[PDB]
């Protein structure tokens, strides 16, 4: 058998359906599966009060507040606060049961159902690790992970070191491999291979050793971008093979240890770290507990030969011939194959749901593309027209929203428009017409509109499978300007800013220059524009290279007349900031000179000096005090969540008390126990 140890099977095992089913149901030691289940349950229990928002459920789901919500389906509606607290309690109990191994199936379902309900209840909280947690819970629901290191097996006799079918490990290994490979392939983008997505991450002190032999640009392009792409592409291949298993394990451990500190992504790094030993032999915990000193080998459960189990099948040459697969053996193989096909196909299913395709393909959360695209927003304007009288009015951007993700997606914008249309009659406004004007620059590009500002979103047509017509295309033929843009940005002073704008033909921009924005100018780059002055009604055509100067405290308009998109910049200085800083420097230096031989302006410098001194003292202060403060904050969050959940459970079960008792209980809930 040449390939009988580099792959774990033979070529003859994939020649027929019966042979494949027999292979996929091979018995296997359940030790590593049990360890993974324990770790995943522990991490989910630790994570539910923090990331899922159990501590802010009262803030998010108040009884009578006006808020616009963004569910996947408008038929899904939230429950009152008490029932939401009950659902979170059920989720916590399910996670605890999954960790402990007691009542495995019931706990798995009790964690799976409310988790997916909460996930689907809101489209603005989707990311990749929440999707991964849901997928992992779904997979573990159908697996026998309570056969070792559990409590069910300590009450039963057959779940004590039994055997599990082979596909239990195959599904998890495949899931991790698809995660790594799809992330690596998604990182084969123009903005990533050219070092544009993360151009500031290399300045962290964790990259200091690389700066000894490499330049800053070289260490930002070679290490963060190309190294990350290579590791993403090769982690699965390195981990699968036993020849290079140790090297791959070291690399992935180092990668996740740095990632747990570079960003704040919750428990993603720890889940990935705990999922790495799954690629090792299924019996590694047994060897690890055999290698420990003999003085601690008599308290843990005895290491003996595993007993036979009914879940898997046994094919022996002398121990009988063959057991015909039933409706449980073939179902495992079918589930494995179909689930792997679905996981491989879903990230590339953006050609079917065309209504979710903005500048970036699809809804964010299930495509395994992390940090690839970065967005910076410049201005948002919401304008409504009264349908009864015709007055023009302006709304605050995001009055009734608890998130900011609606500015990038057309479906979320449509939902927000409908919600505003519903809630505006409450404020003496007839049936309105709302127009949106949002300027977004992606991956350090020109600032440009994303949606058409001349279309009424309330009456617009949006369909999941139809490409949206009021979404402005991305100006793809302007990226090579980025080098010149960076040069211009770096060729400026420490108090002068620049903003680069690209405008479509036929549209116009109305801007109000602030009073304190003295020395403001506009310079053209491409095409031709017409600059207007509202107060005196004077147009002025401009060409490439020309420069203007705009007065402060007045309106002005910029019109695009060229048959191609045009680009220009704004150059401005905060003259009020300059004057304040220069007088502050005078009043400080001269005061020091007189002393060595209050008012708000002095107060700002006093606060800055106090903050600098505190920062220096904290830097000199050892990390133990910060660790203690972190522990105190976590304990406060946990205690608040527990007290509020108990309060809501008492209210739901016993009965609603008087108002006075609730106020006292709420005040006791937030106390910051000790400091």
């Amino acid at each position: 058998s040449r390939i009988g140890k580099l792959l774990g099977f033979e070529w003859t095992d994939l020649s027929s359906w019966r042979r494949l089913v027999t292979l996929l149901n091979r018995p296997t030691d359940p030790a590593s599966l049990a360890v993974f289940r324990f770790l995943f349950g522990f991490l989910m229990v630790l994570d539910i009060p923090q990331e899922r928002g159990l501590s802010s459920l009262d803030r998010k789901y108040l009884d009578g507040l006006d808020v616009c919500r963004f569910p996947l389906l408008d038929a899904l509606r939230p429950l009152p606060l008490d029932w939401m607290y009950l659902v979170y309690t059920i989720m916590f109990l399910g996670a605890l049961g999954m960790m402990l191994g007691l009542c495995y199936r019931i706990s798995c379902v009790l964690f799976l159902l409310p988790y997916w309900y909460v996930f689907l209840l809101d489209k603005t909280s989707w990311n990749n690790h929440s999707y991964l947690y849901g997928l992992l819970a779904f997979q573990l629901t159908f697996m026998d992970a309570n056969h070792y290191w559990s409590v069910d097996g300590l009450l039963n006799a057959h779940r004590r070191n039994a055997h599990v079918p082979l596909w239990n490990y195959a599904v998890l290994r495949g899931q991790i491999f698809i995660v790594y490979f799809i992330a690596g392939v998604k990182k084969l983008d123009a903005d990533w291979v050219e070092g544009y997505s993360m151009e500031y991450l290399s300045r962290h002190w964790l990259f200091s050793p690389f700066k000894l032999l490499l330049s800053e640009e070289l260490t930002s392009l070679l290490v963060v971008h190309w190294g990350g792409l290579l590791l993403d592409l090769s982690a699965g291949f390195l981990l699968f093979f036993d020849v290079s298993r140790s090297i791959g394990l070291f690399f992935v451990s180092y990668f996740h240890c740095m990632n747990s500190q570079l960003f704040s992504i919750g428990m993603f790094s720890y889940v990935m770290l705990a999922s790495s030993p799954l690629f090792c032999s299924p019996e590694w915990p047994r060897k690890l507990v055999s290698y420990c000193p003999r003085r601690l080998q008599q308290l843990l459960p005895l290491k003996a030969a595993p007993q036979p189990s009914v879940s898997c099948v046994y094919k022996r040459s002398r121990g009988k011939s063959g057991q015909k697969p039933g409706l449980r053996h073939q179902l495992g193989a079918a589930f494995t194959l179909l689930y792997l096909l679905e996981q491989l196909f879903l990230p590339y299913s953006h050609f079917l749901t065309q209504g979710y395709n903005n500048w970036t393909n699809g809804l964010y959360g299930y495509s395994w593309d992390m940090m690839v695209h970065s967005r910076s927003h410049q201005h948002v304007k919401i304008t409504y027209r009264d349908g009864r009288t015709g007055e023009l009015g302006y709304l605050n951007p995001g009055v009734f929203t608890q998130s900011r993700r609606w500015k990038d997606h057309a479906d979320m914008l449509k939902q927000y428009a409908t919600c505003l249309s519903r809630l505006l009659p409450k404020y003496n406004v007839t049936e309105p017409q709302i127009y949106f004007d949002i300027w977004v620059s992606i991956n350090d590009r020109f600032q440009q509109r994303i949606f058409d500002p001349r279309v009424d979103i309330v009456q617009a047509a949006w369909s999941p499978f139809q490409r949206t017509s009021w979404v402005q295309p991305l100006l793809m033929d302007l990226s090579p300007w980025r080098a010149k843009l960076q040069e211009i940005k770096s060729s400026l002073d420490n108090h002068t800013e620049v903003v680069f704008i690209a405008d479509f033909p036929g549209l116009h921009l109305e801007n109000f220059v602030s009073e304190d924005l003295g020395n403001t100018s506009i310079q053209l780059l491409q095409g031709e524009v017409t600059v207007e002055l509202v107060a005196e009604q004077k147009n002025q055509t401009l060409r490439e290279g020309e420069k203007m100067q705009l007065p402060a405290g007045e309106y002005h308009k910029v019109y695009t007349t060229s048959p191609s998109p045009s680009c220009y910049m704004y150059v401005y200085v905060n003259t009020t900031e300059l004057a304040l800083e220069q007088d502050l420097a005078y009043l400080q230096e001269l005061k020091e000179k007189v002393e060595n031989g209050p008012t708000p302006l002095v107060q700002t410098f006093l606060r800055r000096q106090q903050r600098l001194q505190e920062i220096e003292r904290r830097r000199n202060t050892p990390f133990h005090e910060r660790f203690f403060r972190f522990l105190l904050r976590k304990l406060y969050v946990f205690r608040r969540s527990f007290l509020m959940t108990c309060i809501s459970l008492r209210n739901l079960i016993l009965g609603r008390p008087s108002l006075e008792q609730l106020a006292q209980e709420v005040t006791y809930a937030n106390l910051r126990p000790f400091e």
Partner: peptide, 29 residues
């Protein structure tokens, strides 16, 4: 609350935006 603003306050294109940290779409908050 008050969901209305003026015309000179809804047209200030050049202003300190907000920039609430990185706020990447994979951050917890």
């Amino acid at each position: 609350l008050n969901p209305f603003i003026n015309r000179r306050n809804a047209n200030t294109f050049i202003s300190p935006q907000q920039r609430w940290r990185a706020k990447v779409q994979e951050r917890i908050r």
